[PDB]
Enzyme design. Sequence first.
Site, PDB file in Angstrom:
ATOM      1  CG  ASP A   1      68.660  -4.348  61.774  1.00 42.31           C
ATOM      2  OD1 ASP A   1      69.113  -4.241  60.620  1.00 42.31           O
ATOM      3  OD2 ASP A   1      68.165  -3.392  62.409  1.00 42.31           O
ATOM      4  CB  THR A   2      72.458  -7.045  57.902  1.00 41.02           C
ATOM      5  OG1 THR A   2      71.509  -6.415  57.028  1.00 41.02           O
ATOM      6  CG2 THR A   2      72.233  -8.530  57.927  1.00 41.02           C
ATOM      7  N   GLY A   3      71.725  -4.100  59.382  1.00 38.94           N
ATOM      8  CA  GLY A   3      71.963  -2.673  59.472  1.00 38.94           C
ATOM      9  C   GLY A   3      72.255  -2.125  60.857  1.00 38.94           C
TER      10      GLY A   3
HETATM   11  C1  LIG Z   1      71.744   4.046  60.175  1.00 36.76           C
HETATM   12  C2  LIG Z   1      71.480   2.616  59.774  1.00 36.76           C
HETATM   13  C3  LIG Z   1      70.142   2.162  60.357  1.00 36.76           C
HETATM   14  C4  LIG Z   1      69.072   3.238  60.244  1.00 36.76           C
HETATM   15  C5  LIG Z   1      70.369   1.757  61.817  1.00 36.76           C
HETATM   16  N1  LIG Z   1      69.163   1.113  62.389  1.00 36.76           N
HETATM   17  C6  LIG Z   1      68.866  -0.330  62.090  1.00 36.76           C
HETATM   18  C7  LIG Z   1      67.733  -0.441  61.037  1.00 36.76           C
HETATM   19  O1  LIG Z   1      67.587  -1.764  60.649  1.00 36.76           O
HETATM   20  C8  LIG Z   1      66.435   0.057  61.678  1.00 36.76           C
HETATM   21  C9  LIG Z   1      65.915  -0.992  62.715  1.00 36.76           C
HETATM   22  C10 LIG Z   1      64.493  -0.537  63.150  1.00 36.76           C
HETATM   23  C11 LIG Z   1      63.296  -1.277  62.613  1.00 36.76           C
HETATM   24  C12 LIG Z   1      61.917  -0.818  63.008  1.00 36.76           C
HETATM   25  C13 LIG Z   1      61.704   0.324  63.944  1.00 36.76           C
HETATM   26  C14 LIG Z   1      62.887   1.090  64.474  1.00 36.76           C
HETATM   27  C15 LIG Z   1      64.298   0.645  64.089  1.00 36.76           C
HETATM   28  N2  LIG Z   1      65.449   0.107  60.652  1.00 36.76           N
HETATM   29  C16 LIG Z   1      64.947   1.318  60.116  1.00 36.76           C
HETATM   30  O2  LIG Z   1      65.207   2.401  60.580  1.00 36.76           O
HETATM   31  O3  LIG Z   1      64.131   1.122  59.011  1.00 36.76           O
HETATM   32  C17 LIG Z   1      63.315   2.267  58.521  1.00 36.76           C
HETATM   33  C18 LIG Z   1      63.325   2.263  57.227  1.00 36.76           C
HETATM   34  O4  LIG Z   1      62.294   1.041  56.915  1.00 36.76           O
HETATM   35  C19 LIG Z   1      61.310   1.154  57.754  1.00 36.76           C
HETATM   36  O5  LIG Z   1      61.005  -0.229  58.393  1.00 36.76           O
HETATM   37  C20 LIG Z   1      61.574  -0.235  59.592  1.00 36.76           C
HETATM   38  C21 LIG Z   1      61.684   1.317  60.043  1.00 36.76           C
HETATM   39  C22 LIG Z   1      61.830   2.027  58.912  1.00 36.76           C
HETATM   40  S1  LIG Z   1      68.798   1.619  63.986  1.00 36.76           S
HETATM   41  O6  LIG Z   1      67.732   0.802  64.501  1.00 36.76           O
HETATM   42  O7  LIG Z   1      68.633   3.046  64.056  1.00 36.76           O
HETATM   43  C23 LIG Z   1      70.256   1.184  64.909  1.00 36.76           C
HETATM   44  C24 LIG Z   1      70.418  -0.179  65.514  1.00 36.76           C
HETATM   45  C25 LIG Z   1      71.694  -0.505  66.239  1.00 36.76           C
HETATM   46  C26 LIG Z   1      72.770   0.561  66.322  1.00 36.76           C
HETATM   47  N3  LIG Z   1      74.170   0.542  66.988  1.00 36.76           N
HETATM   48  C27 LIG Z   1      74.768   1.821  66.811  1.00 36.76           C
HETATM   49  S2  LIG Z   1      73.823   2.761  66.015  1.00 36.76           S
HETATM   50  C28 LIG Z   1      72.588   1.884  65.782  1.00 36.76           C
HETATM   51  C29 LIG Z   1      71.305   2.207  65.039  1.00 36.76           C
END
Ligand SMILES: CC[C@H](C)CN(C[C@@H](O)[C@H](Cc1ccccc1)NC(=O)O[C@H]1CO[C@H]2OCC[C@H]21)S(=O)(=O)c1ccc2ncsc2c1
Lengths: 99, 99
Positions: A25-27
């Site tokens: 996860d690059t995000g």
């Molecule tokens: C603020 C930037 C994003 C929202 C950060 N997220 C990683 C992201 O990849 C998250 C990772 C994630 C993936 C699946 C469930 C919960 C989290 N995916 C996500 O929220 O995606 C949403 C939008 O598309 C949909 O598909 C997936 C969920 C929905 S996270 O999981 O909240 C995250 C991970 C490590 C981290 N370290 C400090 S803060 C922090 C936050």
Amino acid sequence: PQITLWKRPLVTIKIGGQLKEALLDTGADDTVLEEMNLPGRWKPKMIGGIGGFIKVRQYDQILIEICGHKAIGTVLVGPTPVNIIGRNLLTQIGCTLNF
Amino acid sequence: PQITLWKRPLVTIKIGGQLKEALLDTGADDTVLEEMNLPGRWKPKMIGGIGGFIKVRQYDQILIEICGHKAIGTVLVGPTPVNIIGRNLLTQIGCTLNF
Ligand SMILES: CC[C@H](C)CN(C[C@@H](O)[C@H](Cc1ccccc1)NC(=O)O[C@H]1CO[C@H]2OCC[C@H]21)S(=O)(=O)c1ccc2ncsc2c1
């Protein structure tokens, strides 16, 4: 290897002697794993994303093997719905985005 | 380009004729942008993240340019902590993970 993004980029990891599936996860700044009972000292932390914050336990210097590539760094443990490999370890395995 | 991950993978996007900064997010299925005015019809939807579920406005077939690459697809608008480009558009610009 090269991972396309048609599907979630889930890979097998090895941590604390267990095999698990985790998102590359690059995000994610940090690495966040589903609740598990690791030994050692930890520090409380809160991390935020869509929907708000969750409370996690910060462990330092934890070895994780990602597709046979070894890495060691900070791992957060808490009620995440998915195991997340974040940039702190993706850099260690030489992972890049390419387009 | 090849993007390393020691820094957040932030890029400039163009949507609705406006420039914005967004995070290339391989852990996101969907593209979710902070509150903004977008032309066209939308429908209420819910999306879940690490911290729970939020209400978003779903815009379909929206033109969005990511570092000069064109994508046309679904964009969700709501109280996300950061503009994120998810796999639905990352696939359109040909983005892969490599290590
Ligand atoms: C603020 C930037 C994003 C929202 C950060 N997220 C990683 C992201 O990849 C998250 C990772 C994630 C993936 C699946 C469930 C919960 C989290 N995916 C996500 O929220 O995606 C949403 C939008 O598309 C949909 O598909 C997936 C969920 C929905 S996270 O999981 O909240 C995250 C991970 C490590 C981290 N370290 C400090 S803060 C922090 C936050």
